[PDB]
Amino acid sequence: DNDSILLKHGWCEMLKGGVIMDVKNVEQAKIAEKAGAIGVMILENIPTDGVARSVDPLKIEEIRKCISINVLAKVRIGHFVEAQILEELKVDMLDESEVLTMADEYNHINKHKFKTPFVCGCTNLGEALRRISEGASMIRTKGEAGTGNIIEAIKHIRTVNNEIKYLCSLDESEVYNFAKKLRAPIDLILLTRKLKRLPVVNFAAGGIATPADAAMCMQLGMDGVFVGSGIFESENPQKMASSIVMAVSNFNNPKILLNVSLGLGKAMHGNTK
Amino acid sequence: CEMLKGGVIMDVKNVEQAKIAEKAGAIGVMILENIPTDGVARSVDPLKIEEIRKCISINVLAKVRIGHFVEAQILEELKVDMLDESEVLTMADEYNHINKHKFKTPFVCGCTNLGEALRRISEGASMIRTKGEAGTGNIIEAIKHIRTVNNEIKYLCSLDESEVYNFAKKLRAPIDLILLTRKLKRLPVVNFAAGGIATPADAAMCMQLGMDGVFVGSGIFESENPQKMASSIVMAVSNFNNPKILLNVSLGLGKAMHGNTK
Amino acid sequence: CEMLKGGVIMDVKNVEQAKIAEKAGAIGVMILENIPTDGVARSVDPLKIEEIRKCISINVLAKVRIGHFVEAQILEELKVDMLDESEVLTMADEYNHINKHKFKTPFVCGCTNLGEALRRISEGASMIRTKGEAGTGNIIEAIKHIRTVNNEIKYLCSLDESEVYNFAKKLRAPIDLILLTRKLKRLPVVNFAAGGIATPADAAMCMQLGMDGVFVGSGIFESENPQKMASSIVMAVSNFNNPKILLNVSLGLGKAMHGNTK
Amino acid sequence: DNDSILLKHGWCEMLKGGVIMDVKNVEQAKIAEKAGAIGVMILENIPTDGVARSVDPLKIEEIRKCISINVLAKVRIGHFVEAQILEELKVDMLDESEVLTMADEYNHINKHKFKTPFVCGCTNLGEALRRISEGASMIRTKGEAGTGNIIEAIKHIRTVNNEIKYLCSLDESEVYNFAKKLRAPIDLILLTRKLKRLPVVNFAAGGIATPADAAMCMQLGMDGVFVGSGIFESENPQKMASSIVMAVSNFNNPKILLNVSLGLGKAMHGNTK
Amino acid sequence: CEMLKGGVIMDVKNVEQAKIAEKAGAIGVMILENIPTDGVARSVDPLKIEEIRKCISINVLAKVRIGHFVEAQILEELKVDMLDESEVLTMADEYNHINKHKFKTPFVCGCTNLGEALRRISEGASMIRTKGEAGTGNIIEAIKHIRTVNNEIKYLCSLDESEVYNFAKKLRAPIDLILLTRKLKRLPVVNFAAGGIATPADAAMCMQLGMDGVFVGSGIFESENPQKMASSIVMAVSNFNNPKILLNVSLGLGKAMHGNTK
């Protein structure tokens, strides 16, 4: 248990400073690989009010054999059999995702029962810690998926960042009531507190549409970025893919951020609500 | 009814579909009206059931409206293997269910919670299924219902002998059946999942949660490849604890039914 | 319990009162705490029951708090004829009643409606009484409860075989007992009136409404002339359909208890 | 830490099957000792809307030297300096009590910082577990203190008993959401669950007025009883004290329960609200 | 004001009390009206302050009503060591506090939260205290106020440079002082606890929570033994991290003030 957790943590650290990109087909995977993505996340190829489920394993197998970077897939919240199936397929990581249709409205997957590490979403520290408590090895913000608007991600990033530095301030007495307020396990609160940060890798996700969005999230202390619609719905996916990677790798160098933002084309249109 | 354990019952609108079901390894078919959008949904014409029954040798089931004891008398004459008093048809009596004790044909009824289940059994049902959310291809309500019932059963099973009375008053359920439920540690009749099952993964999930089998309809015949979908769901139900086999019957399935999220 | 039909049970606080009761023709006495105003009302000291029991040869009853199965175990050891799990004492368990099936001593319980009655019988009561409104000398709630139960019983008794299920769910009562109640055309245990009875006229009224007997307490020992009041109530209950006798035992009774109207 | 917790647990086990009694003076202590009490709990001697604080240490010292049974005292919730003072006085146990006036409306004492074991109150399983999480070594129901009415204790005893046997039923998946519902630490929930009971000694308290009240609480699975007003406000404190002890030591023997209830006198008058 | 660190200021109504305070080791006394129940509470008569000041050599403080800048001008003439613009007197201006920058005498003001504290400092206060709940002998509100301020300070101290602006708008407090507060990691003036302190244990508790000292009034002079209570509170404040000494000065104290819980 102890060791199997450390093993998954060792593996996820490899992702720090990386960009994972959402792909619908091989051409998209290749673009992503070409751009410097440390991984791709495979999505249903949709040409509707549909139930969104985990993708057909065969479509994952087809894309994975045409690239050599990491390969991730999504399962429905609480759908432990979709996870069992993808575990058997030897995928690199699973995302128990709120963007797919919930399979169980009360329980998340017990992620301790898998060898494959999981990523999960959060908008705040209690939620993050409850996902880690259930066994997630990595966390991301939920942001606002598919809108091309960065505002919710930013809020989620600032909310967890505060609660974390505050928790770090509280006296040994006050920490209990805060645990009860976050409805989070005191063990992981104390650990967040001796580490001075989130105890697992923590990426931004949802709404990233420009190099400037990506670096902002990094300047706020994130370990990396998921991007989807911002790339493949831009005017020039390939150039946008590469500039976002560069930005993530250089998020403190305004001169490179300028450079990679020149003549980028139109960013995804987006949706303000 | 005990025969049915480990099986898949499939909803069919015609003989082609019925044969696909039989070929898949379905242990029974449930015959439905064949519709080409409100509109009253009633018992099928007995003729149609008779046409299908004669072209297969698996079990045959039909639906009657809630409270409609005359639709049931008519189908009883027809010598069908089982009737489903079904909320998916238009209710006929908003207060009373059929008194199922007056039929020789076993009935199946739906539930979302233990008390409802037990009221249906009290009325004479020989089998129970969840209601899930029919025709949506979304598994979430089925899971809710399965878990709601499993919990209430296990909780019940722990309660001290004096506490059962007040619980029985909260379930609004008969104490005989409550005590039997707590002595069997499960539900006292065969108990299947139904409504929303659209993939092999969905079907195995219900089985991993303790169900005795599954009803599937739209998820097969609105998928890309009904024959391959139907066969994979059967394997899944038979092999629900074998993830290697659940992988294999999901490879290259085509698109599952589109569904509707509300 | 069938012995008790046509009788009067009287509440006594000491031997003097107990003898007045016996002399009147009471078929039993119910022993109460002797209080000289909130304050918790518990089981009587067994010693006191023992002192009174030895000075009479009629039946002897005591009260326990609702849910207090240990007060009941203690009195069970004492070999009393009947216990009353009584709302007039301070409840001990706000959710659960005593499981009365674990005692050899019969229990009596209160009710205001058929479903409550039947829940108490399910829990093991051997006798039922109305709750009326104890200690007020006002008959109105008792009459309400008697009529509420009589109606629900007669209504039940008419219902078609399929309608009983939904009714049983509304009474929140066991269907076995409901069906038995409809087959006896009355309540399946001895059933007395209690709370508020202050005159011979009041006692006969409950009997004319179908009750098997009566419990009286304050109405006797807070009247002007307890011995004459007690004896007249006994005659009344024995002669409830004879208005000439009901006149005669009401002449010159003195003042009935004062009461309280709310 | 691990060992200091085991040490306090070892000590509290000594109390199983015992009756602790609340005393205001030496005469009361002596009565309690004579009756078979394994301990007394010392209270302010009040001859008013007063702030109720921990008692003067001197009054504890005076009573303790006239008996040889265990001696307990009360502190105000969140008042860690009252506890520091009584720790230095070498008292046997402290009760962080809701019957005294709260000193801190958000935080309880961090009880891990003391050698003296603590008892705390609860009305339900989350609350119990949060008190253990903070360091309590023993728990009691809150009941309804001073009313002579057993009804609230019973409710509190039944509430924790259920949640405990249910928790014991849930699948390894469902346990997380229940943890979040009880706002309790998953660690102690899992432990309650492998022990099949409350992980610390658990006594009934508040409203016990007859031998019959005491045994009822034991028949419902409690490890023992606190009694106060029921004894010293009865007609015959000494006889009531001894009968309650006997009942607790014999809570399953109806014949002894009868025997010790004969000619007891009047029980405390009480208050129904 | 920095002189005052580690001290106890005590409220006195006359010379006897003032001497008890001085004898105890109080670093100052706060002079109060001597009252033998609504009624308007105003500045003390300067004569009375003058009588007491002359019989002691510790520091001397008096109260003025909130907003009453003329009471303050009068006491300023009198050459007192400190004024307390105090919510315990009847407010004189419901919207504005005294502009304390126009006096040479330092002021102390109350607060329950960081923003209030900082508004008072902006208005010119040289010292701050909590409000607690005066005259009740209940420590709970003081603890609340101490913790509310400590948290907001430590939180503030963590905030990134851009986040401070919106926080300053929520505290409704000046950004200069906010930035100073975050650079000192504490409050930029001397900061005492006040209201409700009734035992040595209470006084040490505030000190263990980071306060620079304490104000006590009713807790001494309404205890059984004011001289012994006063001396023990002084030792406690001087030795707040020494539990062995906190035990010793609490032995045999007599009764603390009765208090009022609301």
Side-chain angles (χ1 to χ4, degrees), chain A residues 106-142:
Chain A
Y106 301 128
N107 311 290
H108 285 66
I109 294 167
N110 172 348
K111 294 158 276 272
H112 294 299
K113 296 201 143 202
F114 299 88
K115 261 166 161 164
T116 310
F118 285 75
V119 61
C120 293
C122 80
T123 70
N124 72 81
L125 183 60
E127 189 179 8
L129 290 177
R130 280 195 299 283
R131 305 288 87 80
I132 295 163
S133 191
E134 294 160 354
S137 302
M138 167 179 181
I139 289 289
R140 63 169 162 77
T141 66
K142 285 191 203 181

mmCIF file of all heavy atoms in Angstrom, chain A residues 106-142:
data_model
loop_
_atom_site.group_PDB
_atom_site.id
_atom_site.type_symbol
_atom_site.label_atom_id
_atom_site.label_comp_id
_atom_site.label_asym_id
_atom_site.label_seq_id
_atom_site.Cartn_x
_atom_site.Cartn_y
_atom_site.Cartn_z
ATOM 1 N N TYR A 106 -23.323 9.342 -5.548
ATOM 2 C CA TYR A 106 -22.747 9.443 -4.199
ATOM 3 C C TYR A 106 -21.270 9.036 -4.012
ATOM 4 O O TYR A 106 -20.561 9.687 -3.238
ATOM 5 C CB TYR A 106 -23.613 8.645 -3.238
ATOM 6 C CG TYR A 106 -25.032 9.145 -3.214
ATOM 7 C CD1 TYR A 106 -26.108 8.263 -3.401
ATOM 8 C CD2 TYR A 106 -25.308 10.506 -3.016
ATOM 9 C CE1 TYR A 106 -27.436 8.725 -3.369
ATOM 10 C CE2 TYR A 106 -26.631 10.979 -3.002
ATOM 11 C CZ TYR A 106 -27.679 10.070 -3.171
ATOM 12 O OH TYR A 106 -28.976 10.502 -3.170
ATOM 13 N N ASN A 107 -20.821 7.981 -4.696
ATOM 14 C CA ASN A 107 -19.490 7.455 -4.538
ATOM 15 C C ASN A 107 -18.566 7.616 -5.748
ATOM 16 O O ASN A 107 -18.977 7.331 -6.887
ATOM 17 C CB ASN A 107 -19.628 5.963 -4.248
ATOM 18 C CG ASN A 107 -20.638 5.674 -3.152
ATOM 19 O OD1 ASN A 107 -20.389 5.983 -1.997
ATOM 20 N ND2 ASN A 107 -21.785 5.060 -3.517
ATOM 21 N N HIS A 108 -17.322 8.001 -5.501
ATOM 22 C CA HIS A 108 -16.240 7.931 -6.506
ATOM 23 C C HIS A 108 -15.627 6.516 -6.515
ATOM 24 O O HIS A 108 -15.903 5.712 -5.627
ATOM 25 C CB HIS A 108 -15.157 9.010 -6.249
ATOM 26 C CG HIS A 108 -15.574 10.398 -6.649
ATOM 27 N ND1 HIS A 108 -16.583 11.079 -6.008
ATOM 28 C CD2 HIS A 108 -15.147 11.215 -7.646
ATOM 29 C CE1 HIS A 108 -16.747 12.260 -6.574
ATOM 30 N NE2 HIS A 108 -15.897 12.363 -7.574
ATOM 31 N N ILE A 109 -14.854 6.191 -7.552
ATOM 32 C CA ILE A 109 -14.161 4.922 -7.625
ATOM 33 C C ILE A 109 -13.215 4.842 -6.437
ATOM 34 O O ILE A 109 -12.635 5.885 -6.024
ATOM 35 C CB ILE A 109 -13.330 4.828 -8.933
ATOM 36 C CG1 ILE A 109 -14.272 4.811 -10.167
ATOM 37 C CG2 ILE A 109 -12.401 3.626 -8.884
ATOM 38 C CD1 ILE A 109 -13.580 5.045 -11.505
ATOM 39 N N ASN A 110 -13.082 3.649 -5.858
ATOM 40 C CA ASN A 110 -12.034 3.461 -4.864
ATOM 41 C C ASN A 110 -10.726 3.197 -5.615
ATOM 42 O O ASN A 110 -10.542 2.096 -6.139
ATOM 43 C CB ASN A 110 -12.378 2.308 -3.923
ATOM 44 C CG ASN A 110 -11.239 1.953 -2.995
ATOM 45 O OD1 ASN A 110 -10.098 2.403 -3.164
ATOM 46 N ND2 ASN A 110 -11.540 1.111 -2.019
ATOM 47 N N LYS A 111 -9.844 4.204 -5.675
ATOM 48 C CA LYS A 111 -8.781 4.177 -6.659
ATOM 49 C C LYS A 111 -7.553 3.415 -6.123
ATOM 50 O O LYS A 111 -6.617 3.074 -6.899
ATOM 51 C CB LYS A 111 -8.460 5.589 -7.102
ATOM 52 C CG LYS A 111 -9.605 6.230 -7.841
ATOM 53 C CD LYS A 111 -9.549 7.728 -7.831
ATOM 54 C CE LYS A 111 -10.147 8.283 -6.574
ATOM 55 N NZ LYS A 111 -11.600 8.472 -6.768
ATOM 56 N N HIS A 112 -7.617 3.086 -4.819
ATOM 57 C CA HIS A 112 -6.593 2.243 -4.147
ATOM 58 C C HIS A 112 -6.548 0.837 -4.741
ATOM 59 O O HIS A 112 -5.559 0.131 -4.613
ATOM 60 C CB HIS A 112 -6.865 2.125 -2.639
ATOM 61 C CG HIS A 112 -6.734 3.422 -1.890
ATOM 62 N ND1 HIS A 112 -5.543 4.121 -1.839
ATOM 63 C CD2 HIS A 112 -7.628 4.133 -1.152
ATOM 64 C CE1 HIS A 112 -5.709 5.206 -1.102
ATOM 65 N NE2 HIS A 112 -6.959 5.241 -0.672
ATOM 66 N N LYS A 113 -7.633 0.441 -5.396
ATOM 67 C CA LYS A 113 -7.730 -0.887 -5.970
ATOM 68 C C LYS A 113 -7.147 -1.047 -7.378
ATOM 69 O O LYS A 113 -7.372 -2.057 -8.022
ATOM 70 C CB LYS A 113 -9.184 -1.299 -6.002
ATOM 71 C CG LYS A 113 -9.740 -1.424 -4.621
ATOM 72 C CD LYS A 113 -10.964 -2.301 -4.650
ATOM 73 C CE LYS A 113 -11.065 -3.179 -3.414
ATOM 74 N NZ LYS A 113 -11.942 -4.384 -3.703
ATOM 75 N N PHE A 114 -6.379 -0.067 -7.834
ATOM 76 C CA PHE A 114 -5.821 -0.117 -9.156
ATOM 77 C C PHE A 114 -4.362 0.183 -9.126
ATOM 78 O O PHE A 114 -3.878 0.958 -8.294
ATOM 79 C CB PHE A 114 -6.501 0.917 -10.045
ATOM 80 C CG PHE A 114 -7.919 0.686 -10.195
ATOM 81 C CD1 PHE A 114 -8.811 1.221 -9.299
ATOM 82 C CD2 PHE A 114 -8.386 -0.135 -11.183
ATOM 83 C CE1 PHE A 114 -10.156 0.967 -9.406
ATOM 84 C CE2 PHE A 114 -9.739 -0.394 -11.302
ATOM 85 C CZ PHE A 114 -10.624 0.173 -10.408
ATOM 86 N N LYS A 115 -3.668 -0.417 -10.077
ATOM 87 C CA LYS A 115 -2.267 -0.146 -10.297
ATOM 88 C C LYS A 115 -2.063 1.129 -11.104
ATOM 89 O O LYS A 115 -1.090 1.851 -10.926
ATOM 90 C CB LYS A 115 -1.635 -1.326 -11.016
ATOM 91 C CG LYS A 115 -0.914 -2.232 -10.058
ATOM 92 C CD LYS A 115 -0.572 -3.590 -10.681
ATOM 93 C CE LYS A 115 0.558 -4.288 -9.861
ATOM 94 N NZ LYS A 115 0.701 -5.781 -10.161
ATOM 95 N N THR A 116 -3.009 1.406 -11.987
ATOM 96 C CA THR A 116 -2.938 2.596 -12.811
ATOM 97 C C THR A 116 -3.217 3.815 -11.964
ATOM 98 O O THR A 116 -4.166 3.822 -11.165
ATOM 99 C CB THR A 116 -3.953 2.535 -13.893
ATOM 100 O OG1 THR A 116 -3.827 1.269 -14.556
ATOM 101 C CG2 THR A 116 -3.736 3.674 -14.860
ATOM 102 N N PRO A 117 -2.354 4.827 -12.078
ATOM 103 C CA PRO A 117 -2.626 5.979 -11.246
ATOM 104 C C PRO A 117 -3.855 6.707 -11.810
ATOM 105 O O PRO A 117 -4.085 6.669 -13.037
ATOM 106 C CB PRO A 117 -1.361 6.796 -11.383
ATOM 107 C CG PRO A 117 -0.845 6.391 -12.751
ATOM 108 C CD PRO A 117 -1.089 4.941 -12.820
ATOM 109 N N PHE A 118 -4.609 7.370 -10.915
ATOM 110 C CA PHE A 118 -5.668 8.301 -11.291
ATOM 111 C C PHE A 118 -5.358 9.782 -11.064
ATOM 112 O O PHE A 118 -4.732 10.185 -10.051
ATOM 113 C CB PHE A 118 -6.913 8.062 -10.458
ATOM 114 C CG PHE A 118 -7.671 6.856 -10.839
ATOM 115 C CD1 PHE A 118 -7.207 5.596 -10.502
ATOM 116 C CD2 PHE A 118 -8.896 6.976 -11.486
ATOM 117 C CE1 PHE A 118 -7.914 4.474 -10.860
ATOM 118 C CE2 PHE A 118 -9.631 5.847 -11.847
ATOM 119 C CZ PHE A 118 -9.144 4.612 -11.539
ATOM 120 N N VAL A 119 -5.875 10.578 -11.999
ATOM 121 C CA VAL A 119 -6.080 11.994 -11.818
ATOM 122 C C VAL A 119 -7.595 12.248 -11.536
ATOM 123 O O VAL A 119 -8.445 11.519 -12.037
ATOM 124 C CB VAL A 119 -5.546 12.852 -13.039
ATOM 125 C CG1 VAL A 119 -6.238 12.500 -14.300
ATOM 126 C CG2 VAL A 119 -5.693 14.384 -12.768
ATOM 127 N N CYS A 120 -7.892 13.245 -10.688
ATOM 128 C CA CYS A 120 -9.250 13.736 -10.425
ATOM 129 C C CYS A 120 -9.296 15.253 -10.379
ATOM 130 O O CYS A 120 -8.258 15.921 -10.214
ATOM 131 C CB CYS A 120 -9.737 13.245 -9.075
ATOM 132 S SG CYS A 120 -10.001 11.488 -8.973
ATOM 133 N N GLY A 121 -10.510 15.799 -10.463
ATOM 134 C CA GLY A 121 -10.723 17.232 -10.483
ATOM 135 C C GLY A 121 -11.106 17.818 -9.135
ATOM 136 O O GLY A 121 -11.574 17.100 -8.283
ATOM 137 N N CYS A 122 -10.886 19.119 -8.950
ATOM 138 C CA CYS A 122 -11.290 19.812 -7.758
ATOM 139 C C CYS A 122 -11.499 21.286 -8.025
ATOM 140 O O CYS A 122 -11.020 21.833 -9.029
ATOM 141 C CB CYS A 122 -10.245 19.639 -6.664
ATOM 142 S SG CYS A 122 -8.794 20.687 -6.769
ATOM 143 N N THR A 123 -12.283 21.908 -7.161
ATOM 144 C CA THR A 123 -12.460 23.349 -7.162
ATOM 145 C C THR A 123 -12.031 23.887 -5.821
ATOM 146 O O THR A 123 -12.109 25.070 -5.581
ATOM 147 C CB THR A 123 -13.925 23.741 -7.317
ATOM 148 O OG1 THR A 123 -14.598 23.384 -6.108
ATOM 149 C CG2 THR A 123 -14.569 23.061 -8.526
ATOM 150 N N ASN A 124 -11.586 23.038 -4.916
ATOM 151 C CA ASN A 124 -11.242 23.534 -3.589
ATOM 152 C C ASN A 124 -10.505 22.493 -2.799
ATOM 153 O O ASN A 124 -10.527 21.355 -3.174
ATOM 154 C CB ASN A 124 -12.477 23.971 -2.799
ATOM 155 C CG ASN A 124 -13.316 22.788 -2.338
ATOM 156 O OD1 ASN A 124 -13.040 22.144 -1.344
ATOM 157 N ND2 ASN A 124 -14.325 22.499 -3.076
ATOM 158 N N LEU A 125 -9.901 22.863 -1.679
ATOM 159 C CA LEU A 125 -8.975 21.937 -0.998
ATOM 160 C C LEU A 125 -9.611 20.671 -0.352
ATOM 161 O O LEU A 125 -9.013 19.582 -0.373
ATOM 162 C CB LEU A 125 -8.145 22.649 0.069
ATOM 163 C CG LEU A 125 -7.100 21.796 0.802
ATOM 164 C CD1 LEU A 125 -6.107 21.240 -0.150
ATOM 165 C CD2 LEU A 125 -6.336 22.544 1.939
ATOM 166 N N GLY A 126 -10.770 20.806 0.275
ATOM 167 C CA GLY A 126 -11.431 19.628 0.823
ATOM 168 C C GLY A 126 -11.651 18.576 -0.264
ATOM 169 O O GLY A 126 -11.176 17.439 -0.141
ATOM 170 N N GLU A 127 -12.337 18.977 -1.338
ATOM 171 C CA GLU A 127 -12.549 18.130 -2.514
ATOM 172 C C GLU A 127 -11.210 17.507 -3.000
ATOM 173 O O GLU A 127 -11.111 16.303 -3.201
ATOM 174 C CB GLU A 127 -13.247 18.964 -3.567
ATOM 175 C CG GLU A 127 -13.762 18.265 -4.785
ATOM 176 C CD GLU A 127 -14.455 19.223 -5.752
ATOM 177 O OE1 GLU A 127 -14.426 20.484 -5.572
ATOM 178 O OE2 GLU A 127 -15.016 18.680 -6.733
ATOM 179 N N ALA A 128 -10.151 18.282 -3.116
ATOM 180 C CA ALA A 128 -8.893 17.694 -3.562
ATOM 181 C C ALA A 128 -8.489 16.565 -2.620
ATOM 182 O O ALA A 128 -8.100 15.455 -3.023
ATOM 183 C CB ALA A 128 -7.789 18.750 -3.593
ATOM 184 N N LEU A 129 -8.558 16.867 -1.337
ATOM 185 C CA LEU A 129 -8.022 15.955 -0.354
ATOM 186 C C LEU A 129 -8.870 14.683 -0.228
ATOM 187 O O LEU A 129 -8.352 13.599 0.119
ATOM 188 C CB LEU A 129 -7.908 16.609 1.009
ATOM 189 C CG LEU A 129 -6.832 17.676 1.097
ATOM 190 C CD1 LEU A 129 -6.934 18.244 2.505
ATOM 191 C CD2 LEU A 129 -5.426 17.085 0.785
ATOM 192 N N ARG A 130 -10.161 14.816 -0.479
ATOM 193 C CA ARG A 130 -11.043 13.660 -0.465
ATOM 194 C C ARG A 130 -10.766 12.728 -1.659
ATOM 195 O O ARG A 130 -10.843 11.496 -1.527
ATOM 196 C CB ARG A 130 -12.513 14.118 -0.500
ATOM 197 C CG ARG A 130 -13.089 14.572 0.861
ATOM 198 C CD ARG A 130 -14.668 14.668 0.818
ATOM 199 N NE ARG A 130 -15.161 15.641 -0.180
ATOM 200 C CZ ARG A 130 -15.155 16.963 -0.021
ATOM 201 N NH1 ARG A 130 -14.672 17.500 1.110
ATOM 202 N NH2 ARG A 130 -15.614 17.743 -1.000
ATOM 203 N N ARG A 131 -10.453 13.319 -2.821
ATOM 204 C CA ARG A 131 -9.998 12.545 -3.982
ATOM 205 C C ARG A 131 -8.667 11.845 -3.715
ATOM 206 O O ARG A 131 -8.543 10.665 -3.989
ATOM 207 C CB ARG A 131 -9.905 13.395 -5.242
ATOM 208 C CG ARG A 131 -11.169 14.118 -5.621
ATOM 209 C CD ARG A 131 -12.230 13.184 -6.166
ATOM 210 N NE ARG A 131 -13.024 12.627 -5.108
ATOM 211 C CZ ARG A 131 -14.023 13.274 -4.510
ATOM 212 N NH1 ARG A 131 -14.395 14.501 -4.898
ATOM 213 N NH2 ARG A 131 -14.667 12.686 -3.521
ATOM 214 N N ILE A 132 -7.698 12.525 -3.131
ATOM 215 C CA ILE A 132 -6.440 11.851 -2.700
ATOM 216 C C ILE A 132 -6.743 10.741 -1.661
ATOM 217 O O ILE A 132 -6.162 9.636 -1.659
ATOM 218 C CB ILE A 132 -5.434 12.858 -2.103
ATOM 219 C CG1 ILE A 132 -4.987 13.857 -3.199
ATOM 220 C CG2 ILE A 132 -4.244 12.119 -1.570
ATOM 221 C CD1 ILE A 132 -4.326 15.138 -2.686
ATOM 222 N N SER A 133 -7.657 11.033 -0.748
ATOM 223 C CA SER A 133 -7.973 10.069 0.297
ATOM 224 C C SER A 133 -8.509 8.761 -0.338
ATOM 225 O O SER A 133 -8.167 7.660 0.067
ATOM 226 C CB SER A 133 -9.049 10.671 1.171
ATOM 227 O OG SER A 133 -9.240 9.920 2.325
ATOM 228 N N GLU A 134 -9.315 8.913 -1.391
ATOM 229 C CA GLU A 134 -9.863 7.793 -2.153
ATOM 230 C C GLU A 134 -8.817 7.106 -3.023
ATOM 231 O O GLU A 134 -9.093 6.028 -3.584
ATOM 232 C CB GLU A 134 -10.963 8.270 -3.125
ATOM 233 C CG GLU A 134 -12.203 8.807 -2.483
ATOM 234 C CD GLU A 134 -13.055 9.691 -3.362
ATOM 235 O OE1 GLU A 134 -12.668 10.041 -4.527
ATOM 236 O OE2 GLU A 134 -14.140 10.070 -2.828
ATOM 237 N N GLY A 135 -7.661 7.748 -3.215
ATOM 238 C CA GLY A 135 -6.577 7.119 -3.958
ATOM 239 C C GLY A 135 -6.062 7.826 -5.196
ATOM 240 O O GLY A 135 -5.217 7.272 -5.913
ATOM 241 N N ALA A 136 -6.519 9.037 -5.473
ATOM 242 C CA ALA A 136 -6.032 9.720 -6.663
ATOM 243 C C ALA A 136 -4.536 9.953 -6.422
ATOM 244 O O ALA A 136 -4.168 10.144 -5.289
ATOM 245 C CB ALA A 136 -6.782 11.029 -6.885
ATOM 246 N N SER A 137 -3.714 9.884 -7.475
ATOM 247 C CA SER A 137 -2.266 10.177 -7.451
ATOM 248 C C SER A 137 -1.963 11.568 -7.994
ATOM 249 O O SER A 137 -0.834 12.030 -7.918
ATOM 250 C CB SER A 137 -1.511 9.174 -8.324
ATOM 251 O OG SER A 137 -1.737 7.834 -7.898
ATOM 252 N N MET A 138 -2.953 12.216 -8.598
ATOM 253 C CA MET A 138 -2.727 13.527 -9.231
ATOM 254 C C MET A 138 -4.044 14.291 -9.179
ATOM 255 O O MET A 138 -5.087 13.686 -9.101
ATOM 256 C CB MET A 138 -2.187 13.335 -10.664
ATOM 257 C CG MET A 138 -2.180 14.573 -11.576
ATOM 258 S SD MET A 138 -1.480 14.214 -13.217
ATOM 259 C CE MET A 138 -1.557 15.808 -14.026
ATOM 260 N N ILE A 139 -3.993 15.619 -9.178
ATOM 261 C CA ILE A 139 -5.190 16.427 -9.161
ATOM 262 C C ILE A 139 -5.118 17.495 -10.228
ATOM 263 O O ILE A 139 -4.044 17.999 -10.536
ATOM 264 C CB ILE A 139 -5.356 17.118 -7.774
ATOM 265 C CG1 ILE A 139 -5.740 16.085 -6.692
ATOM 266 C CG2 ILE A 139 -6.384 18.272 -7.806
ATOM 267 C CD1 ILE A 139 -7.149 15.520 -6.789
ATOM 268 N N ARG A 140 -6.285 17.882 -10.735
ATOM 269 C CA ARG A 140 -6.401 19.028 -11.557
ATOM 270 C C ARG A 140 -7.581 19.897 -11.121
ATOM 271 O O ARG A 140 -8.553 19.416 -10.475
ATOM 272 C CB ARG A 140 -6.575 18.576 -13.010
ATOM 273 C CG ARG A 140 -7.818 17.796 -13.254
ATOM 274 C CD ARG A 140 -8.148 17.565 -14.770
ATOM 275 N NE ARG A 140 -9.102 16.459 -14.780
ATOM 276 C CZ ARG A 140 -10.396 16.580 -14.471
ATOM 277 N NH1 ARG A 140 -10.943 17.778 -14.292
ATOM 278 N NH2 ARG A 140 -11.164 15.494 -14.384
ATOM 279 N N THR A 141 -7.536 21.171 -11.509
ATOM 280 C CA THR A 141 -8.691 22.036 -11.343
ATOM 281 C C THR A 141 -9.744 21.563 -12.319
ATOM 282 O O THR A 141 -9.425 20.797 -13.291
ATOM 283 C CB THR A 141 -8.382 23.447 -11.696
ATOM 284 O OG1 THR A 141 -8.092 23.538 -13.089
ATOM 285 C CG2 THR A 141 -7.199 23.961 -10.875
ATOM 286 N N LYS A 142 -10.998 21.930 -12.055
ATOM 287 C CA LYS A 142 -12.062 21.578 -12.953
ATOM 288 C C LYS A 142 -12.128 22.632 -14.006
ATOM 289 O O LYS A 142 -12.406 22.323 -15.183
ATOM 290 C CB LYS A 142 -13.412 21.507 -12.257
ATOM 291 C CG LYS A 142 -13.588 20.247 -11.379
ATOM 292 C CD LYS A 142 -15.040 20.048 -10.899
ATOM 293 C CE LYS A 142 -15.066 19.181 -9.631
ATOM 294 N NZ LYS A 142 -16.413 18.868 -9.033
#
